[PDB]
Amino acid sequence: VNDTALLTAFKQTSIKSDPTNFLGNWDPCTWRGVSCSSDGRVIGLDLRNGGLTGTLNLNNLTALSNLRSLYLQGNNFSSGDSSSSSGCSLEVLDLSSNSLTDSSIVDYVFSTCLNLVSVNFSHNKLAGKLKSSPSASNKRITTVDLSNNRFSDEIPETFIADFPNSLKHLDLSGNNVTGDFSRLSFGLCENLTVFSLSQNSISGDRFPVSLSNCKLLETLNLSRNSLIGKIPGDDYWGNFQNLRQLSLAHNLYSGEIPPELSLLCRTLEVLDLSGNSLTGQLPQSFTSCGSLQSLNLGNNKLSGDFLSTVVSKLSRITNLYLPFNNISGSVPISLTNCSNLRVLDLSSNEFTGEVPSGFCSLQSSSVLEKLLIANNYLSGTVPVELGKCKSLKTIDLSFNALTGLIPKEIWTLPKLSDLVMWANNLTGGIPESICVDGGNLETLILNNNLLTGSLPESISKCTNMLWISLSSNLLTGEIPVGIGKLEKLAILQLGNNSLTGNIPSELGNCKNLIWLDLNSNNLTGNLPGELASQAGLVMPGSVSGKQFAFVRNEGGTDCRGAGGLVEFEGIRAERLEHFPMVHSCPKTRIYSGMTMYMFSSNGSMIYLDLSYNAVSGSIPLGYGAMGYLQVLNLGHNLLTGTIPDSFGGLKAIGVLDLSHNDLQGFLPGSLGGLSFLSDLDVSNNNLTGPIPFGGQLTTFPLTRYANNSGLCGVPLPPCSS
Amino acid sequence: VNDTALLTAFKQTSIKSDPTNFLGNWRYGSGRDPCTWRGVSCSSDGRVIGLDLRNGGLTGTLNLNNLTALSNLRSLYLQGNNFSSGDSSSSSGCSLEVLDLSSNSLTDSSIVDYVFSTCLNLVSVNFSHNKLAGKLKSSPSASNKRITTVDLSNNRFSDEIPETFIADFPNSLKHLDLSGNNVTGDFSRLSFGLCENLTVFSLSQNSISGDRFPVSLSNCKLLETLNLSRNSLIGKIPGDDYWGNFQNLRQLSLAHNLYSGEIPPELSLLCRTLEVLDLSGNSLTGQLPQSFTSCGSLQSLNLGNNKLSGDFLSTVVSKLSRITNLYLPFNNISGSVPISLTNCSNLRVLDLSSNEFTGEVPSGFCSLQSSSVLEKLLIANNYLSGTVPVELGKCKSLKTIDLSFNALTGLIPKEIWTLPKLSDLVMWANNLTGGIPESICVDGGNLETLILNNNLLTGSLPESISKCTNMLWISLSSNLLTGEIPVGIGKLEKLAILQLGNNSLTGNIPSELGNCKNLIWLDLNSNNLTGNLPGELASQAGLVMPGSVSGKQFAFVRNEGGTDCRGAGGLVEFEGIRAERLEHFPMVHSCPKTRIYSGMTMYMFSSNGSMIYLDLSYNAVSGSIPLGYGAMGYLQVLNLGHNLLTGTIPDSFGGLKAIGVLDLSHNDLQGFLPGSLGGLSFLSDLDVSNNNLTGPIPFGGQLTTFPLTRYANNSGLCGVPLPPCSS
Ligand SMILES: *[C@@H]1O[C@H](CO)[C@@H](O[C@@H]2O[C@H](CO)[C@@H](O[C@@H]3O[C@H](CO[C@H]4O[C@H](CO[C@H]5O[C@H](CO)[C@@H](O)[C@H](O)[C@@H]5O[C@H]5O[C@H](CO)[C@@H](O)[C@H](O)[C@@H]5O)[C@@H](O)[C@H](O[C@H]5O[C@H](CO)[C@@H](O)[C@H](O)[C@@H]5O[C@H]5O[C@H](CO)[C@@H](O)[C@H](O)[C@@H]5O)[C@@H]4O)[C@@H](O)[C@H](O[C@H]4O[C@H](CO)[C@@H](O)[C@H](O)[C@@H]4O[C@H]4O[C@H](CO)[C@@H](O)[C@H](O)[C@@H]4O[C@H]4O[C@H](CO)[C@@H](O)[C@H](O)[C@@H]4O)[C@@H]3O)[C@H](O)[C@H]2NC(C)=O)[C@H](O)[C@H]1NC(C)=O
Ligand SMILES: *[C@@H]1O[C@H](CO)[C@@H](O[C@@H]2O[C@H](CO)[C@@H](O[C@@H]3O[C@H](CO[C@H]4O[C@H](CO[C@H]5O[C@H](CO)[C@@H](O)[C@H](O)[C@@H]5O[C@H]5O[C@H](CO)[C@@H](O)[C@H](O)[C@@H]5O)[C@@H](O)[C@H](O[C@H]5O[C@H](CO)[C@@H](O)[C@H](O)[C@@H]5O[C@H]5O[C@H](CO)[C@@H](O)[C@H](O)[C@@H]5O)[C@@H]4O)[C@@H](O)[C@H](O[C@H]4O[C@H](CO)[C@@H](O)[C@H](O)[C@@H]4O[C@H]4O[C@H](CO)[C@@H](O)[C@H](O)[C@@H]4O[C@H]4O[C@H](CO)[C@@H](O)[C@H](O)[C@@H]4O)[C@@H]3O)[C@H](O)[C@H]2NC(C)=O)[C@H](O)[C@H]1NC(C)=O
Ligand SMILES: CC(C)[C@H](C)[C@@H](O)[C@H](O)[C@@H](C)[C@H]1CC[C@H]2[C@@H]3COC(=O)[C@H]4C[C@H](O)[C@H](O)C[C@]4(C)[C@H]3CC[C@]12C
Ligand SMILES: CC(C)[C@H](C)[C@@H](O)[C@H](O)[C@@H](C)[C@H]1CC[C@H]2[C@@H]3COC(=O)[C@H]4C[C@H](O)[C@H](O)C[C@]4(C)[C@H]3CC[C@]12C
Numbered sequence A: 001v002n003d004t005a006l007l008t009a010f011k012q013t014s015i016k017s018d019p020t021n022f023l024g025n026w027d028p029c030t031w032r033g034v035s036c037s038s039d040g041r042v043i044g045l046d047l048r049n050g051g052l053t054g055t056l057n058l059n060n061l062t063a064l065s066n067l068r069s070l071y072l073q074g075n076n077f078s079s080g081d082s083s084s085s086s087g088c089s090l091e092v093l094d095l096s097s098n099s100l101t102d103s104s105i106v107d108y109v110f111s112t113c114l115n116l117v118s119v120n121f122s123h124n125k126l127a128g129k130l131k132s133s134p135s136a137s138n139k140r141i142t143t144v145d146l147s148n149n150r151f152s153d154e155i156p157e158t159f160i161a162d163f164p165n166s167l168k169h170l171d172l173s174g175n176n177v178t179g180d181f182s183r184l185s186f187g188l189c190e191n192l193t194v195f196s197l198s199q200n201s202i203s204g205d206r207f208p209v210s211l212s213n214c215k216l217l218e219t220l221n222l223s224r225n226s227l228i229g230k231i232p233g234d235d236y237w238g239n240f241q242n243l244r245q246l247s248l249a250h251n252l253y254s255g256e257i258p259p260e261l262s263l264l265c266r267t268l269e270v271l272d273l274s275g276n277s278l279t280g281q282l283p284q285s286f287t288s289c290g291s292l293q294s295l296n297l298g299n300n301k302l303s304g305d306f307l308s309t310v311v312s313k314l315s316r317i318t319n320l321y322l323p324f325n326n327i328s329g330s331v332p333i334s335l336t337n338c339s340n341l342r343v344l345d346l347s348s349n350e351f352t353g354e355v356p357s358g359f360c361s362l363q364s365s366s367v368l369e370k371l372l373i374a375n376n377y378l379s380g381t382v383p384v385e386l387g388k389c390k391s392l393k394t395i396d397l398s399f400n401a402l403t404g405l406i407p408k409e410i411w412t413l414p415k416l417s418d419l420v421m422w423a424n425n426l427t428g429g430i431p432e433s434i435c436v437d438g439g440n441l442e443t444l445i446l447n448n449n450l451l452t453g454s455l456p457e458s459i460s461k462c463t464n465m466l467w468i469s470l471s472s473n474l475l476t477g478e479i480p481v482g483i484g485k486l487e488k489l490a491i492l493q494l495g496n497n498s499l500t501g502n503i504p505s506e507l508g509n510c511k512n513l514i515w516l517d518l519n520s521n522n523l524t525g526n527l528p529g530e531l532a533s534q535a536g537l538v539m540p541g542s543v544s545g546k547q548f549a550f551v552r553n554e555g556g557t558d559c560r561g562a563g564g565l566v567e568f569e570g571i572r573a574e575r576l577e578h579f580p581m582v583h584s585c586p587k588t589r590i591y592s593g594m595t596m597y598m599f600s601s602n603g604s605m606i607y608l609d610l611s612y613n614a615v616s617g618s619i620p621l622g623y624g625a626m627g628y629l630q631v632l633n634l635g636h637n638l639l640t641g642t643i644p645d646s647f648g649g650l651k652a653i654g655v656l657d658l659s660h661n662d663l664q665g666f667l668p669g670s671l672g673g674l675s676f677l678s679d680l681d682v683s684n685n686n687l688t689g690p691i692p693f694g695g696q697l698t699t700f701p702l703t704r705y706a707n708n709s710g711l712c713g714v715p716l717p718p719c720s721s
Numbered sequence B: 001v002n003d004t005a006l007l008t009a010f011k012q013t014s015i016k017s018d019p020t021n022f023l024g025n026w027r028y029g030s031g032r033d034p035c036t037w038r039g040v041s042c043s044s045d046g047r048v049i050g051l052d053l054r055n056g057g058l059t060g061t062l063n064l065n066n067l068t069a070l071s072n073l074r075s076l077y078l079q080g081n082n083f084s085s086g087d088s089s090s091s092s093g094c095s096l097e098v099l100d101l102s103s104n105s106l107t108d109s110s111i112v113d114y115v116f117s118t119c120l121n122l123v124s125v126n127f128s129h130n131k132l133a134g135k136l137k138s139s140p141s142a143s144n145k146r147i148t149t150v151d152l153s154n155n156r157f158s159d160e161i162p163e164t165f166i167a168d169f170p171n172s173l174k175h176l177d178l179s180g181n182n183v184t185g186d187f188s189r190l191s192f193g194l195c196e197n198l199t200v201f202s203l204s205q206n207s208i209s210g211d212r213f214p215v216s217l218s219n220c221k222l223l224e225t226l227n228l229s230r231n232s233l234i235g236k237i238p239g240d241d242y243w244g245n246f247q248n249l250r251q252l253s254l255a256h257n258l259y260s261g262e263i264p265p266e267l268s269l270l271c272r273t274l275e276v277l278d279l280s281g282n283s284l285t286g287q288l289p290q291s292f293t294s295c296g297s298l299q300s301l302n303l304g305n306n307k308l309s310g311d312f313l314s315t316v317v318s319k320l321s322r323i324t325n326l327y328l329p330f331n332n333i334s335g336s337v338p339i340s341l342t343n344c345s346n347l348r349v350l351d352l353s354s355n356e357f358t359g360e361v362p363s364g365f366c367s368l369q370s371s372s373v374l375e376k377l378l379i380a381n382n383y384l385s386g387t388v389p390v391e392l393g394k395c396k397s398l399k400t401i402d403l404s405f406n407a408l409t410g411l412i413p414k415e416i417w418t419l420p421k422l423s424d425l426v427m428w429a430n431n432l433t434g435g436i437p438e439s440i441c442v443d444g445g446n447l448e449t450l451i452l453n454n455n456l457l458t459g460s461l462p463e464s465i466s467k468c469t470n471m472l473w474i475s476l477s478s479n480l481l482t483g484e485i486p487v488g489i490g491k492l493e494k495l496a497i498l499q500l501g502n503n504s505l506t507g508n509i510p511s512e513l514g515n516c517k518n519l520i521w522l523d524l525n526s527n528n529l530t531g532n533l534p535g536e537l538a539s540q541a542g543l544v545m546p547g548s549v550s551g552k553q554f555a556f557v558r559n560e561g562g563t564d565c566r567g568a569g570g571l572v573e574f575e576g577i578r579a580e581r582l583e584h585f586p587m588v589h590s591c592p593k594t595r596i597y598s599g600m601t602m603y604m605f606s607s608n609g610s611m612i613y614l615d616l617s618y619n620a621v622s623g624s625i626p627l628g629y630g631a632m633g634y635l636q637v638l639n640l641g642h643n644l645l646t647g648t649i650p651d652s653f654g655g656l657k658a659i660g661v662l663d664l665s666h667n668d669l670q671g672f673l674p675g676s677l678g679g680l681s682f683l684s685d686l687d688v689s690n691n692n693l694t695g696p697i698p699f700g701g702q703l704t705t706f707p708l709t710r711y712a713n714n715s716g717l718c719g720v721p722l723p724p725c726s727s
């Protein structure tokens, strides 16, 4: 079994697709990826990020006697058959991003592969229970990563302790193991510096006593589990005098934050206690955390002036998150003594007074990049001093009591990318100098204000724009044709204003536009067929991964618009349930989550509301080819012609509203082939003929077809009579 | 020398006055046995075992040696008299067991060294409330097996406490009171000894220092009250398991020291027993720790005048079952008033003044499933907004509402004016509107205090004010009142302070004001009054008795801009308010130059007083100045400036000996300045400008000292500081 004849046996037997042609040209040492040695033997195979699709069995590669490095990460390998039985010389194995399901691969590497130093099985589909530790005859293994798999059920009491004493890095995150944490043995845990059980289902009100034996621990991550009770205090955290990162976030801890946790402050760099039910405040003992950089205490019930009596004295703070707490009063001015502050999040608290801006007038230029104080009760005007924070990229003042104009100094911040200040009483307009003298923005979210004027053609200069929201303002003028230069724009909301003119044809050049809401304006002209000219070509983009809330208007056509999408970073849902904009419709529901595309390529527009305008002409035939379109509201216009038969192509549609127009002709039969059409309304037109018998049409209420010119068939009186 | 004869030499040598004839029974005649004598008590065999002459108005010089010579004297109660100190003697074989010499004028502390060295059977000795001066040095003799209670409080002891002073007391000591002196010392250096029976200890009101507690103090396992208030203790409050040493402690006070930092959670080790806590008047920060949820016996919690903040009112205080008196004023608590505070179903007194509260006034304490026991609601000097909740009418036990210095608006609902027990209605410095109903103190409570100045009240002062016979202080200044001053005010014979300045009142100054027996402060400036100065305002001169307005927190902002500034100053009720909030109140800067005085209302006379402050300026009063005005011997401010007065300045005004401010400017006064004004030694602010005065300016007293502007615009005044009359 020659080495050159093994790799060829691997290529033919295991790999079933190589569109990169990066496994072609397959002497041993000249083959792509395989790094050889001087004496002609193969020692490593590096095929990372190759887009390879096949079935893997490690015995077919460990048969290579001198193979010590195997990199197969970033591919699409599946689990193979047991096959053959050979020794293993591997010192470094990486199988990070694949589709491996048979966890017997981990049993092999842990039983053989005795010289193994590091192995990464992460991000796969390895299933089953955790059983075997690395062999005791292995004296070298230092780092083992089994994170992000599908391992199930309990963890063996001595699973961690059974590891070789050389272990340094053990990561078990991203599974669904279970068990009382207190009954899990770490053993001697000598040399262990990094350990994570994050994102599992571990329970218990105690830590295992053996955990205290890990004197050299630098990272302890226990987040997103079900640990309960009080955070251990007294003397416990003195056991870990090297700990740089501790996370206990998103468990069920209660009580106050133990002052005794400050025995890590000699070395503690990162802390995450967020997502619990902690009260009181950060104890004064933490003034000694001269090394702390990231302090995350969000989503708890903390209160008091500990922001000034403690946090301001942390000379090296750079990332301070206390959103979703019970902190009242002014934002203390002393917080500016945090010279190195880059990200400050104080959203969803009870802060009053003025927007903090002192950070910008230090004796040194401020490095503050993100300022987030949404869902508070800040009053006054957007202070002009923020213009001196030249490193600002994200300003989130939404859902406050702000008033007055938006100073010119904000639109001139050189690196600004996100301007988020919806849900205030801000007045003024949009300068004609946006994004040209100021930063090229990604989000401009100022809906639910009192802004006046028109949207400048200068918006064409914001080529990076992903999301524009200016709904429910007092805007006027025409929609600028320059919007067409924004080929990364994904969401555009301008509803409930007084816009006039045509819907520009140039909107068709917005390559990534998936969400267009222009309801409740004064728009005229024809429907531009160019709106669908990107159907089947839309690519996703950087608008994914943003917090959003959707307010569904469940009142049919009487209620203006199909609903309301809002950027929802840092805002409690309750603050929205009491926003009178919600009660504008007698029936509402709050969908909530993170923006997520449902396609990888070749998509279409997702949400289209042009209702309540004065648009005339005929529905462009092309509109029906939008396969991912889930909402199409053209109600309350002056549309004429027939409903195109192409609408049988709206596979994804769930809400279709064409009511209150002057449409003629027949309902397309293909409407019955829409398996998700759950909200139809064609009432108040000149429609005639039978109601399609397919799909869900025969069940919609009589209200949805009424005030037409000869519709018949269930739910109406039958056509044959 | 026979017990009957010993008592005889006491009445002669010592007693110097017996105004009640308490000691009249002390005569040798019918049954000369001393047991018929008043205050004397004998044993069956006929010898004296006790002498009780308490609160008997006895005045004289005391030497105990003449009384301790009684072989069988075991009790001697002389408290509450006016005994001074005589010259001590070496000793006289003492056998006392109980000694009470409280409330006298004793000065020589050698009486204490005597009683502590002899009298080896003393169980209790009370020297409190005297003038005993000097250092502490001597503890009770080591031969005294019995002494339990020693009260040395409210004296004039000085300088260092001996490190072993407390430890050298017999081991039977249970009560030791050292408060009310000015003794110094590091508290960590003080030895309590084995502290085996001590249960009540106090060093409060002294000048004691240190940043630690003495280790010895933890030996007092049976302590029940510990009071170290009003001293100079610094540092953090002791924590760790220290308070575990006091498993019976009921009352702890560390108030008014220099403590800083947080409240130690391990202070909660008292919470099985703690009934009364007072940490007020320090620089404590943070919150009341969560460990205090277990203080189910805590009745009084006082954390006022600190830097506390947070939501501990809700997360801790609301879960305390038996809290009756809750004081958190002068802190940094922001947010809204926690509604969960209503779960405290025994709360009688709530004070949340001088914090940063926002929102509405609590409307929940009253509308509960049982009779609300709430008696005092104090939320002055916050940022509360809205209207006074009608719900307060359900708090049928309310006696005091203080909502002053907020941003409240609207009308006072009649449900406030009908609280049957209401006594103090204090809501000044707001934007309230409407008027005083016509049915005050009839359907509602007979008020002591109606303080609504600096508001937007309209209408007249109803005559039904005559029904508030308990009234002590009315303040409606700087409102929009109209109408006349009701003559019914003359029925308020307890009224001491009436402030109505800066309204649009018309009519006369009712002569019925002269029947207000206790009126000492009358302020009607900047109104539209007319008629003549009623001479009855002085009818109480020399007869005014002090009253219950005494003891209330006040602030007087003195306007130092001359007569051009309206009125002679602002007296305002100031409970629960920070002086800083007054320095930024626009009334305070209406006059350019100002200075804020503050304190507690105090009378300078015990009887036979006069009015103290009379401001009637900026009206249209005409006529002559009543001569009787000059006989107000305690009058200190008299401002009749800016009126239409005519005639001469009474020569009677030489009797205004207490006067310091006298403004008669801008009138039509005529004649000479009485030379008797020269005898007004305290006159420091005089203005008679803009009158018709003429002739020489008097030479004695201060009348030659005032600026030129204070005699100007008259018709021929001469004499220094003006040009001489002879030229
Ligand atoms: C332990 O362990 C753990 C694990 O286990 C970890 O954690 C982790 O972390 C990380 C960090 O990094 C992260 O990641 C990130 O994230 C973000 C987001 O975040 C957020 O969210 C998330 C999500 O969530 C979700 O899920 C969850 C679960 O998982 C849940 O719970 C929730 O609810 C949600 O869910 C939702 O959604 C979903 C999806 O859709 C669905 O399914 C569902 O149904 C729903 O709907 C989360 O996770 C997070 O969390 C966090 O946070 C919080 C707050 O804070 C807290 O509480 C928690 O705890 C956590 O924590 C963390 O963090 C924090 C902060 O935040 C701190 O403090 C602490 O410590 C920690 O760390 C949140 O919430 C995102 O954003 C990102 O992304 C990024 O990156 C990436 C890469 O990596 C990429 O790809 C992308 O793109 C991005 O990027 C960006 O950035 C970068 C730099 O960095 C760059 O490069 C780029 O470009 C970008 O940029 C930006 O900016 C710019 C300007 O400059 C512009 O231009 C652009 O455009 C943009 O904008 C990331 O991914 C993750 O997530 C986590 N995980 C967990 C599981 O947790 C930790 O870390 C440990 N610890 C220690 C201490 O060590
Ligand atoms: C410890 O020890 C100590 C000793 O040292 C003690 O203390 C004490 O206490 C007591 C109580 O108990 C007291 O007494 C009382 O008082 C009151 C007042 O009070 C207030 O004031 C005061 C005074 O002040 C002053 O002084 C000081 C020092 O000395 C200073 O610091 C200040 O500043 C001031 O000074 C000022 O003034 C003066 C005078 O003028 C001058 O000289 C100067 O210069 C200046 O100007 C004080 O002291 C107090 O304090 C308190 O409080 C606070 C707050 O809260 C705090 O912080 C503090 O600490 C304290 O505390 C205490 O108290 C509290 C309560 O409040 C509590 O909580 C705590 O715990 C403690 O205790 C204040 O501020 C008055 O009022 C009173 O009187 C009353 O009583 C008597 C007898 O009892 C009588 O005679 C009178 O008349 C009255 O009576 C009333 O009541 C009763 C019952 O009780 C009745 O029966 C009657 O009838 C009456 O009633 C009323 O009401 C009603 C209705 O309800 C009506 O009808 C009627 O009309 C009326 O109104 C008393 O006197 C004292 O003072 C103290 N002392 C000291 C030194 O501090 C303690 O206690 C201890 N502790 C334990 C625990 O044990
Ligand atoms: C890509 C983002 C911009 C976007 C918010 C996205 O993440 C999100 O998942 C979108 C597509 C969702 C959020 C709320 C959804 C709507 C919620 O409202 C509704 O009432 C339902 C009713 C019914 O199920 C319809 O079929 C779909 C319909 C009408 C949904 C259509 C799809 C959404 C509009
Ligand atoms: C008994 C209460 C009604 C009263 C507030 C009382 O306690 C209080 O002591 C009064 C009498 C004091 C408080 C402030 C005092 C004034 C302090 O401020 C002043 O302007 C001085 C100036 C000058 O020294 C005058 O001679 C006295 C005068 C003008 C004082 C007159 C007396 C007071 C008005």
Ligand SMILES: *[C@@H]1O[C@H](CO)[C@@H](O[C@@H]2O[C@H](CO)[C@@H](O)[C@H](O)[C@H]2NC(C)=O)[C@H](O)[C@H]1NC(C)=O
Residues within 6 Å of the ligand: A013, A014, A055, A056, A057, A060, A080, A081, A083, A084
């Ligand atoms: C690893 O090598 C073994 C041995 O050649 C492979 O097993 C053979 O697979 C072929 C093709 O399916 C069968 O016809 C033979 O019967 C199998 N066994 C032999 C030859 O002994 C195995 O498939 C290889 N691994 C992978 C994943 O393909």
Ligand SMILES: *[C@@H]1O[C@H](CO)[C@@H](O[C@@H]2O[C@H](CO)[C@@H](O)[C@H](O)[C@H]2NC(C)=O)[C@H](O)[C@H]1NC(C)=O
Residues within 6 Å of the ligand: A472, A473, A496, A520, A560, A580, A584
């Ligand atoms: C468009 O936005 C305006 C914002 O003003 C909405 O007008 C509000 O209507 C509600 C009705 O309940 C009133 O309570 C508010 O006072 C109105 N706002 C103001 C500022 O006066 C209007 O309803 C919105 N229209 C739609 C269809 O959403």
Ligand SMILES: *[C@@H]1O[C@H](CO)[C@@H](O[C@@H]2O[C@H](CO)[C@@H](O)[C@H](O)[C@H]2NC(C)=O)[C@H](O)[C@H]1NC(C)=O
Residues within 6 Å of the ligand: A535, A536, A537, A601, A602
């Ligand atoms: C899916 O999208 C791709 C990429 O846009 C389309 O295919 C290519 O499109 C580009 C222009 O962007 C042309 O230059 C290529 O010649 C196209 N290649 C093809 C068609 O193989 C593709 O047409 C889309 N598929 C649909 C709509 O079904």
Ligand SMILES: *[C@@H]1O[C@H](CO)[C@@H](O[C@@H]2O[C@H](CO)[C@@H](O)[C@H](O)[C@H]2NC(C)=O)[C@H](O)[C@H]1NC(C)=O
Residues within 6 Å of the ligand: B059, B060, B082, B083, B084, B105
């Ligand atoms: C209490 O006793 C003192 C003495 O200790 C009395 O003070 C004397 O008063 C008279 C006038 O009545 C003066 O002549 C004396 O000079 C005062 N003596 C001193 C030392 O000042 C005081 O009057 C008595 N108080 C009463 C009886 O109320």
Ligand SMILES: *[C@@H]1O[C@H](CO)[C@@H](O[C@@H]2O[C@H](CO)[C@@H](O)[C@H](O)[C@H]2NC(C)=O)[C@H](O)[C@H]1NC(C)=O
Residues within 6 Å of the ligand: B541, B542, B543, B607, B608
């Ligand atoms: C001091 O006041 C007392 C009583 O407050 C006066 O003495 C008596 O006062 C009553 C009125 O309350 C008169 O009817 C009596 O005639 C007075 N008795 C006398 C004078 O013996 C006392 O006159 C006052 N002293 C003054 C004003 O100097």
Ligand SMILES: *[C@@H]1O[C@H](CO)[C@@H](O[C@@H]2O[C@H](CO)[C@@H](O)[C@H](O)[C@H]2NC(C)=O)[C@H](O)[C@H]1NC(C)=O
Residues within 6 Å of the ligand: B478, B479, B502, B526, B566, B585, B586, B587, B588, B589, B590
């Ligand atoms: C009487 O009280 C009124 C209360 O409104 C005073 O009027 C205000 O006085 C302040 C003083 O600083 C000024 O700043 C305000 O502008 C005044 N308001 C108005 C509407 O005029 C008034 O000054 C008081 N009068 C006197 C003589 O003191």
Ligand SMILES: *[C@@H]1O[C@H](CO)[C@@H](O[C@@H]2O[C@H](CO)[C@@H](O)[C@H](O)[C@H]2NC(C)=O)[C@H](O)[C@H]1NC(C)=O
Residues within 6 Å of the ligand: B668, B690, B691, B692, B713, B714, B715
């Ligand atoms: C002094 O007072 C007299 C009045 O008492 C002033 O002189 C006259 O006053 C009467 C009113 O009584 C007026 O009718 C006259 O017109 C006054 N005469 C003049 C010439 O004005 C006098 O002016 C007063 N002087 C000062 C400085 O106040």
Ligand SMILES: *[C@@H]1O[C@H](CO)[C@@H](O)[C@H](O)[C@H]1NC(C)=O
Residues within 6 Å of the ligand: A048, A049, A073, A074, A075, A096, A097
């Ligand atoms: C792509 O290759 C880089 C460089 O070796 C590696 O760090 C990364 O993990 C690969 N990406 C994957 C496996 O998704």
Ligand SMILES: *[C@@H]1O[C@H](CO)[C@@H](O)[C@H](O)[C@H]1NC(C)=O
Residues within 6 Å of the ligand: A400, A401, A423, A424, A425, A448, A449
């Ligand atoms: C604008 O101010 C009014 C004042 O009543 C307030 O109710 C409203 O909520 C403010 N607007 C927004 C969007 O919060």
Ligand SMILES: *[C@@H]1O[C@H](CO)[C@@H](O)[C@H](O)[C@H]1NC(C)=O
Residues within 6 Å of the ligand: A685, A686, A709
């Ligand atoms: C269609 O309907 C409209 C209004 O319903 C009516 O006025 C019009 O005449 C109709 N047109 C036809 C049938 O062509």
Ligand SMILES: *[C@@H]1O[C@H](CO)[C@@H](O)[C@H](O)[C@H]1NC(C)=O
Residues within 6 Å of the ligand: B054, B055, B079, B080, B081, B102, B103
């Ligand atoms: C009055 O006598 C009582 C009864 O002994 C005593 O308690 C009280 O202190 C006396 N009053 C004084 C000393 O002021």
Ligand SMILES: *[C@@H]1O[C@H](CO)[C@@H](O)[C@H](O)[C@H]1NC(C)=O
Residues within 6 Å of the ligand: B146, B148, B171, B172, B196, B197
């Ligand atoms: C003082 O305590 C000691 C020790 O407990 C005891 O012997 C003595 O009797 C106590 N004295 C009194 C008066 O209770």
